[PDB]
Design goal:
Two copies of one chain form a homodimer.
Chain A (H helix, E strand, L loop, with lengths): L5 E3 L4 H11 L1 E5 L4 H17 L20 E3 L7 H7 L3 H11 L5 E11 L30 E7 L11 E2 L18 E2 L7 E5 L4 E2 L10 E10 L13 H5 L3 H6 L23 H4 L9
Parallel strand pairs in A: 1-2
Antiparallel strand pairs in A: 2-8, 3-4, 4-10, 5-8, 5-10, 6-7, 6-9
The complex binds 4-Methoxydehydrocyclopeptin (2 copies), bromide ion (4 copies), chloride ion (2 copies), potassium ion (2 copies) and nickel (II) ion (2 copies).
The site of one bromide ion has 4 residues of chain A, from loops.
Enzyme class (chains A, B): oxidoreductase
Family (chains A, B): Belongs to the PhyH family.
Subunit structure (chains A, B): Homodimer.
Chain lengths: ~290, ~290
């Protein structure tokens, strides 16, 4: 069976979205440099260690789906200079997103999360993303352009033995799911900084950790049209942090108004015909 | 031809959403009391008078669709005690919205706007709402439950002569629009405080103002699932104003996390498994 197409971040940029449109998945080699991976890992390290179980009794939005041994840290902008500067301004991410979402209009981060999978973490059931947050997506026409995509960035090696992601190629176009089986999957074997790009219709799962020794870490960036509500809020991020960002990064975090692709678009998150950023006199690129 | 069904806010509450599901429109008699209408009118009056043309050159999100003589004022919470207290906590509005949106989950305000139509304002072309802001809605399956509804509340008399709304009954179920004609419409004749309730698929239009003397005013409340991005932002509303509101009103303005109807919902606008309101220690019902 066909392996996941592998593309250059550097050379093949125009080919990435077309590849995912056709196959439902592509591996972007060196999506992030090892330097950015090192910085992001160092910055999020302590937040992963203090993070309670996904369904902790102290949480008012517990995640009952993730393995109890899994750790998920989102709202990364206040945690990680590497995330809010390098990742939110990624030339490769923005080319792919504008290619993917041009029919709809502006896009933003639905969730940027570091996930750490514990040794012996079981395989996730085969699934499509967004079904625990956005019931609306199941009501879209079968041939509706993808309204979200997910960059699964390796922050540690992804191997067959340590639970590298499974995908079913072509499954983003499936209506009948009677053929859904682990028999139909191929693996995203990845070095740190490689990214597996899938759509919200690609059938996939986290793999089984079978070594009982290896901790696997990823940065999952769900990018979606600005018409869909993010899984995460940046409302509590300090204004000085927001004002250190590029206007583009501010938009991705919901600290800007948003535009649809409608010819006479009237906009999203506006204030009497003016933008958030104009109304609030929101500064940009002010160092901390 | 059949007239728009008229229902009691007081007695018929369980019948309102079923009526709109069947017919695409219903008139809710005395949706708002005359006292609430009087207060809301007095509170928004000066903001309507200072409001520039919809496509003013000073605006970075101009509205090129509305008549140049029309005035639209949104983000009403900071302007209007009557809006943020009485209207956002309306028992009738919340029963209808929970009836309409239960398949999807939480709902919030996509836009609360006062519109003032000038004497001699022309009829709007027959349309469905949301097509200048949410291209996604056109990609929903034909039988997808409505993801937004619009309360068109009369703040002045709606008469045939002064441009009372037109609706095509049953048009929320239309796929083929070859029968779209003003010949197919009936009128929402309404007293101040009556509301015309339509869905995002009901074909309708503002009527022609033919007297050349009458100014018509309405409060349009587009309620939508929390999975869809509002047309307007409350991000610049002062925290003391937000903290004066009920927890429900805070949720409607996007100053709370949101839940989907998914059995193991993981939520919207959360912060590492906790709500906005828990994270920010957001107080409620603190008088100004
Ligand atoms: C154990 O099996 C699983 C675990 C997760 C999912 C899927 C999701 C989801 O749809 N969205 C995201 C997106 C990014 C990161 C996490 C999640 C997440 O938390 N869940 C629940 C399915 C199956
Ligand atoms: C002159 O003809 C028109 C004028 C308006 C619309 C429709 C919209 C719309 O879809 N959404 C809303 C919702 C509430 C209030 C205003 C609007 C609005 O601004 N427009 C543009 C159509 C036709
Ligand atoms: Br997991
Ligand atoms: Br994974
Ligand atoms: Br108009
Ligand atoms: Br109207
Ligand atoms: Cl616990
Ligand atoms: Cl002007
Ligand atoms: K699942
Ligand atoms: K129109
Ligand atoms: Ni997944
Ligand atoms: Ni309309």
């Amino acid at each position: 069976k066909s392996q996941i197409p592998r593309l250059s971040a550097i050379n093949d940029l125009h080919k990435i979205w077309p590849t995912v449109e056709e196959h439902g998945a592509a591996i972007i080699e060196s999506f992030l440099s090892l330097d950015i991976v090192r910085r992001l890992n160092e910055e999020v390290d302590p937040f992963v260690k203090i993070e309670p179980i996904p369904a902790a009794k102290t949480k008012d939005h517990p995640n009952h789906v993730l393995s109890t041994t899994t750790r998920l840290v989102n709202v990364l902008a206040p945690i990680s200079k590497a995330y809010r500067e390098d990742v939110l301004n990624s030339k490769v991410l923005h080319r792919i997103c504008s290619d993917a979402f041009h029919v709809y209009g502006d896009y933003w981060v639905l969730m940027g999360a570091v996930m750490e999978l514990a040794p012996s973490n079981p395989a996730q059931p085969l699934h499509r993303d967004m079904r625990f947050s956005h019931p609306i997506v199941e009501y879209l026409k079968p041939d509706a352009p993808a309204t979200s995509i997910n960059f699964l960035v390796a922050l540690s090696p992804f191997t067959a033995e340590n639970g590298a992601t499974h995908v079913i190629l072509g499954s983003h176009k499936w209506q009948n799911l009677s053929n859904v089986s682990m028999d139909a999957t191929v693996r995203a074997l990845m070095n740190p900084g490689d990214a597996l790009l899938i759509t919200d219709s690609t059938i996939h799962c986290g793999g089984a950790e079978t070594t009982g020794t290896e901790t696997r870490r990823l940065l999952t960036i769900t990018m979606g049209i600005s018409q869909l509500t993010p899984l995460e809020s940046n409302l509590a991020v300090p204004r000085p942090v927001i004002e250190s960002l590029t206007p583009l990064a501010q938009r991705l975090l919901g600290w800007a108004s948003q535009r649809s692709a409608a010819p006479r678009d009237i906009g999203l998150l506006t204030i009497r015909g003016n933008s958030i950023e104009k109304t609030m006199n929101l500064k940009a690129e002010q160092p901390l």
